[PDB]
Each structure stands twice: as C-alpha cells, then as structure tokens.
C-alpha cells in the first residue's frame, strides 16, 4: 500500500508556487526539500543524500537538519526554510540553484530580543515561516523560545516580533505583554494585517497583529488561565467551547477562512476567524491511514498544509509519511486522497559537531569519543587534538593540544576572558581499527563552574 512505498520520512510542512504549479515538501527526517508538480511528479531535490548537516552551496552540496517550515517568495523564486535543528533560516535560490543561510548559525541561542544582522543573530528552533511580500519580511514561529520573530529580507535584521519568552497563552496588546506556547505554524491573512498562529502547546489558534505585535485568541485553549497547557481535547463549536490538541499547522485561504491540522487528534479542521466557529473537515480522530469521504477518513499526526488557487488543500500527513489532498470545492462530497509521488527517490548517500553553548565563566570540558562495537583505538597512532578559539584569547583552554586517553577521552579546563560570545574549536585526529571537529560556543551567564560533556561516536 501507499504506506510501505513512501520515499518520505515524517514530512512536516509544505509550501506551494501556484504560478508555476510546484509543491515544496519538507521531507523532515530525510533532511531534504523535495519539489514536485501538483500531481506529485518529481522536479528537483535539495539534500539528496538525506544526511543531517549544515552546509550552504549547490543543491548537490547543501545540507539541512530536520527542516520544518517553508515559504515561497514569488517575486524572486526563492524558498525560505525553517531549518529547525540547525537553528537557522535558509534560502533556496531556484534561479541559481544554491542554498544560503539567512539567519542563525547552527547553534541554539538564548537571545530573547535579537536585532543583529543575518548569521550573527542566533535562533532557537524555528519551526515555521511565512513571507509578507509588501514589506518583505519573513515571520518565524520560534518554537524554542515561545516567540514570533521577524527577518527583514532587505537588510537581514532578525529580531523578536512578539512574545516575552514565557510559555503561556497570553494575548496582550504589545510584544512584551503577549506570550506563546510552542508556536509551530504561521500563516498570513489575505490583507496581510494579521498572522494566524498554531499555538501548539496551549492547543489554540491565535491571531498576531502585524502592526502592533499584540495577539488575540481565536479558538481552543483556556481564555482565563494563560498558564494552563492542559485545556485540550477534541470538541467542535464556537470560541471557548472548542477543544484542540497540539495543532502544528495553520493556513489562511484567500477567502479568509482558516484550515488547521489538529495534529494530536488526527484531524483537519476549519476555523471561521470571524465567528470563531471550528468544525471538523477530515478525519475520525483515530490515528490511521484511510482515504475516501472526509468524515470517515483517517490521518496520523498531520502537521502542515498548503493550498492551490483552485481549492486543493494539501496536507503533510506526518506520521503516515504521506502527502494527502482534499478538493475543497466538492463540499460535502469531499474526499481525501493520497498524492502518489512519481520519480521521488528515497535518499541515496572532517566531521563537524555543534556543541550546546557553554554558559559558565569557568569549568571543564569532558570530551569523549565513542567507537562502534568491534572497533578499538589504535596503539601506534594515539588520537590527538588541537584547540583554537574563534576570537583568539576570548577563552583560555588549558590543554591547547594533546592526546586522547585509551578510552578516547580528555578533560580541558577553560575560563572565558570576558563577557562576549566566542567559539572554541577542538579538532581531533582519531585513529581506530577520522577527523572530527567540535565547535563549542562560549558565553558568560553564570559565575558557577560548569562541566559539560562533549560526545561523538
Ligand atoms: Na505548512
């Protein structure tokens, strides 16, 4: 059946180019973007090896790491990518067939304000993107920090747009009097005045004001206890009668109506943002795979949506690893069907290790390199390391070079020289019977000593 033959693995998100009839698939756990026509015929992929990585360049060289949201720039023929586990915003240029990084730098940030340019601005688990084509802004659902961010296409400034960073369903009128709760989907309204948000961990749909940074609650969740993350269930109705569970995807159609994936209830739902009425569109609520009449069909953790001008709604049916679609024009005779992918192959494939940032002024790095079963480190070729700090002298790292222990381990003492951020690079030549570079971000946020573990197998 369709499940056994799918070349996808947990596709999370979709975008569409309705002018040139292209579907963009975030094949998330294959670390690649697939481009097909609207009938599922393969056109091109970016990330054909399927390997996790963080690499700019040609379509042959580029690498992603569990990417999620996509947004298409019709004016420039570019695809924006929320490259979640690289904490980066990427750009796929179809004119020149190149990938480049717009913002973020591969390391998870803890910057709740931003305002830096391009790759000097760190991000935190960006999950979804949408492109506002008049003011040329990419809005980012920054799931890791419970915020919405704004990337300025014309100058690269990347900044917080809304949300104080606390996880709650709080709908104030200014960016610092709003909060989100794992926002994982974002879609612009027809007038480009609001963005609709899938606020996954409050189990609600919200509307963000693109002029003020304030937000309002449309349906789902607890309108009276902002801290309540347990107001979930599966109930159609109006406003506060509505229960959802962990919606990951949201889409605003040209007529202003909202489609959403009520992900943990295995349903597609329709929200009228004017009346706040939510009705089930497709799915019984039981996890599964069944095509046909929409009310009797089954999905499994659907998470992304895209729509054609003619009313064909595509769904990334994530846990089934399938793309499905519904023709909305059919009304109550609507059916959900599976996009049969054609010509889409499964993936056919110095190591870099991004390390979690070190937050203590002083401490020790516990470096351990593991081997597979059967292998052991060489004897007449001890594995040696060398240490460099990206701004020289920014961190004093006491053994700047040496040999690894018989277990492939070593301990390095460090102290940061100031209050600014830096990067330490530990380059290792390991002989077993490879070349691995650990990239360690450093920034001072505590005066207590830390002792992180740095690992590679
Ligand atoms: Na999507």
């Amino acid at each position: 059946g369709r499940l056994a033959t799918s070349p996808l693995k947990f596709p999370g998100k979709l975008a569409i180019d309705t002018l040139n009839n292209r579907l963009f698939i975030s094949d998330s756990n294959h670390n690649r973007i697939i481009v097909t026509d609207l009938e599922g015929n393969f056109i091109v992929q970016i990330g054909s090896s399927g390997e996790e990585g963080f690499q700019d360049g040609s379509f042959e060289d580029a690498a992603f790491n569990r990417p999620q949201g996509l947004a298409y720039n019709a004016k420039k023929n570019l695809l924006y990518v929320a490259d979640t586990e690289n904490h980066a915003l990427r750009e796929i240029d179809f004119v020149n067939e190149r990938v480049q990084t717009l913002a973020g730098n591969g390391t998870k940030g803890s910057d709740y304000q931003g305002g830096r340019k391009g790759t000097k601005q760190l991000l935190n688990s960006p999950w979804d993107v949408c492109f506002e084509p008049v003011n040329e802004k990419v809005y980012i659902a920054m799931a890791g920090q419970h915020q919405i961010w704004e990337y300025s296409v014309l100058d690269g400034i990347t900044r917080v747009f809304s949300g104080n960073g606390y996880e709650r369903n709080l709908n104030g009128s200014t960016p610092q009097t709003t909060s989100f709760a794992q926002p994982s989907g974002i879609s612009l309204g027809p007038d480009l005045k609001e963005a609709y948000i899938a606020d996954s961990e409050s189990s609600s749909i919200r509307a963000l004001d693109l002029q003020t940074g304030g937000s309002r609650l449309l349906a789902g969740g607890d309108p009276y206890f902002s801290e309540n993350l347990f107001k979930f269930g599966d109930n159609d109705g109006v406003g506060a009668e509505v229960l959802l569970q962990h919606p990951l995807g949201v889409l605003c159609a040209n007529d202003g109506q909202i489609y959403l994936t009520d992900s943990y209830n295995h349903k597609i739902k329709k929200l009228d943002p004017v009346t706040k009425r939510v009705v089930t569109l497709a799915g019984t609520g039981k996890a599964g795979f069944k095509d046909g009449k929409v009310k009797g069909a089954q999905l499994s953790e659907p998470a992304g949506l895209a729509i054609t001008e003619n009313g064909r709604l595509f769904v990334a049916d994530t846990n089934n690893s399938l793309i499905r679609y519904i023709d909305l024009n059919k009304g109550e005779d609507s059916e959900i069907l599976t996009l049969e992918l054609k010509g889409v192959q499964p993936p056919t494939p110095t190591k870099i290790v991004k390390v979690d940032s070190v937050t203590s002024r002083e401490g020790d790095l516990n470096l351990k390199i593991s081997l597979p079963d059967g292998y052991h480190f060489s004897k007449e070729a001890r594995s040696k390391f060398v240490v460099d700090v990206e701004p020289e002298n920014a961190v004093a790292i006491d053994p700047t070079e040496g040999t690894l222990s018989p277990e492939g381990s070593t301990m390095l003492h460090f102290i940061q020289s100031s209050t600014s951020a830096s990067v330490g690079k530990i380059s290792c030549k390991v002989y077993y019977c490879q070349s691995v570079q650990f990239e360690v971000p450093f920034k001072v946020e505590s005066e207590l000593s830390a002792s992180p573990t740095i690992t590679f197998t």
Side-chain angles (χ1 to χ4, degrees):
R2 306 297 185 190
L3 294 177
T5 58
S6 177
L8 306 182
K9 190 178 173 193
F10 306 140
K13 298 286 186 190
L14 303 171
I16 293 170
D17 164 8
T18 188
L19 188 269
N20 302 294
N21 298 318
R22 293 182 294 164
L23 181 64
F24 307 105
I25 302 162
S26 187
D27 189 12
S28 303
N29 278 58
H30 282 153
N31 308 300
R32 67 184 178 166
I33 278 65
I34 302 165
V35 187
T36 72
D37 71 10
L38 300 184
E39 295 302 320
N41 292 298
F42 178 66
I43 296 171
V44 70
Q45 66 178 316
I46 306 94
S48 68
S49 74
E51 307 254 313
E52 315 172 18
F54 184 39
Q55 281 285 111
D56 288 353
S58 69
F59 285 1
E60 312 85 88
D61 286 347
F64 305 100
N65 190 353
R66 314 281 170 86
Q68 291 288 356
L70 305 173
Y72 182 64
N73 177 338
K75 190 161 163 275
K76 303 282 156 48
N77 188 19
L78 311 171
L79 189 71
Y80 302 115
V81 182
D83 188 12
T84 304
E85 292 293 339
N86 287 327
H87 310 284
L89 177 71
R90 327 289 299 283
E91 176 191 272
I92 303 175
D93 178 353
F94 290 103
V95 180
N96 299 292
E97 298 193 335
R98 254 192 89 258
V99 178
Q100 77 186 344
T101 297
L102 300 186
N105 72 0
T107 88
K108 185 212 283 276
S110 49
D111 177 4
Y112 284 80
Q113 284 185 297
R116 293 170 293 174
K117 184 166 80 73
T119 59
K120 294 143 172 212
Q121 182 54 55
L122 277 60
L123 313 181
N124 187 342
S125 304
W127 211 279
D128 205 9
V129 284
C130 211
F131 177 57
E132 200 285 88
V134 171
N135 295 292
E136 307 229 10
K137 310 289 192 182
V138 176
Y139 292 97
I140 305 162
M142 199 71 70
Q145 276 173 203
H146 312 294
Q147 289 169 320
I148 309 303
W149 281 54
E150 187 195 73
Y151 169 80
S152 172
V153 170
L154 304 179
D155 65 20
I157 296 289
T158 305
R159 72 195 178 86
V160 62
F161 189 77
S162 188
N164 44 40
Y166 295 93
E167 176 164 23
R168 30 180 201 204
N169 182 8
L170 187 64
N171 291 275
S173 307
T174 75
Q176 287 309 288
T177 56
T178 72
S179 303
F180 297 90
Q182 193 90 4
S184 303
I186 184 162
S187 185
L188 300 161
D191 65 9
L192 310 171
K193 290 317 181 169
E194 292 190 298
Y196 299 109
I197 308 298
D199 204 41
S200 305
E201 282 187 352
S202 70
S203 296
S204 67
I205 306 302
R206 296 169 61 190
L208 167 68
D209 183 321
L210 294 185
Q211 301 184 268
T212 67
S215 71
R216 59 202 181 94
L217 180 55
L218 294 180
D222 191 324
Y224 308 113
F225 302 92
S226 69
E227 183 178 2
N228 184 8
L229 300 177
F230 290 86
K231 195 63 144 61
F232 63 79
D234 185 6
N235 196 56
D236 293 349
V238 174
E241 315 176 337
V242 172
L243 294 171
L244 313 172
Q245 187 174 11
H246 204 94
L248 290 170
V250 66
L251 177 145
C252 188
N254 284 1
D255 70 346
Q257 304 298 286
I258 292 163
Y259 297 87
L260 58 136
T261 61
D262 191 8
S263 303
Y264 287 10
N265 288 317
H266 312 296
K267 287 176 166 184
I268 310 301
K269 298 186 167 172
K270 188 173 50 159
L271 158 66
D272 184 337
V274 176
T275 62
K276 326 287 185 280
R277 183 173 189 240
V278 176
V279 303
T280 291
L281 183 75
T284 60
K286 175 167 214 274
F289 170 57
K290 184 185 165 175
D291 279 331
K293 300 309 167 188
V294 284
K295 297 307 202 315
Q298 294 178 75
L299 298 92
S300 192
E301 213 184 310
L305 301 164
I307 200 171
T308 70
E309 287 310 315
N310 302 339
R312 167 166 295 188
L313 181 72
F314 291 90
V315 188
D317 191 14
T318 305
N319 192 64
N320 282 327
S321 296
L322 295 176
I323 305 312
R324 329 263 302 270
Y325 63 90
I326 301 162
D327 284 330
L328 302 169
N329 293 341
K330 278 199 222 104
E332 323 281 341
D333 289 345
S334 285
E335 61 180 345
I336 179 171
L337 298 172
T338 295
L339 193 63
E340 298 155 18
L341 300 188
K342 304 177 256 294
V344 180
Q345 292 279 342
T348 54
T350 290
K351 193 43 150 295
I352 307 275
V353 178
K354 266 75 170 48
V355 180
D356 297 336
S357 311
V358 171
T359 40
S360 279
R361 193 164 263 307
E362 192 175 359
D364 300 283
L365 303 183
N366 298 301
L367 192 143
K368 189 165 190 199
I369 286 185
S370 288
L371 293 186
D373 226 7
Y375 303 84
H376 280 115
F377 299 102
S378 149
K379 182 193 246 204
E380 218 36 70
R382 301 146 207 166
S383 302
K384 293 211 60 138
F385 64 93
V386 68
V387 184
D388 288 309
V389 181
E390 195 202 34
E392 151 167 330
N393 324 123
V395 188
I397 297 178
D398 183 11
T400 38
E401 83 282 306
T403 74
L404 294 190
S405 78
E407 307 93 54
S409 56
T410 190
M411 190 183 278
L412 301 69
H413 193 70
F414 70 87
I415 180 163
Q416 309 192 43
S417 195
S418 67
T419 58
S420 64
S422 57
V423 180
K425 282 154 233 63
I426 310 176
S427 300
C428 298
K429 275 201 252 272
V430 48
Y431 309 107
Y432 61 109
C433 44
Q434 167 141 256
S435 183
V436 47
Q437 181 172 286
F438 303 94
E439 266 162 38
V440 182
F442 288 95
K443 186 164 138 285
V444 179
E445 296 183 341
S446 171
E447 298 287 305
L448 282 163
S449 71
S451 200
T453 304
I454 316 183
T455 57
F456 175 75
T457 58

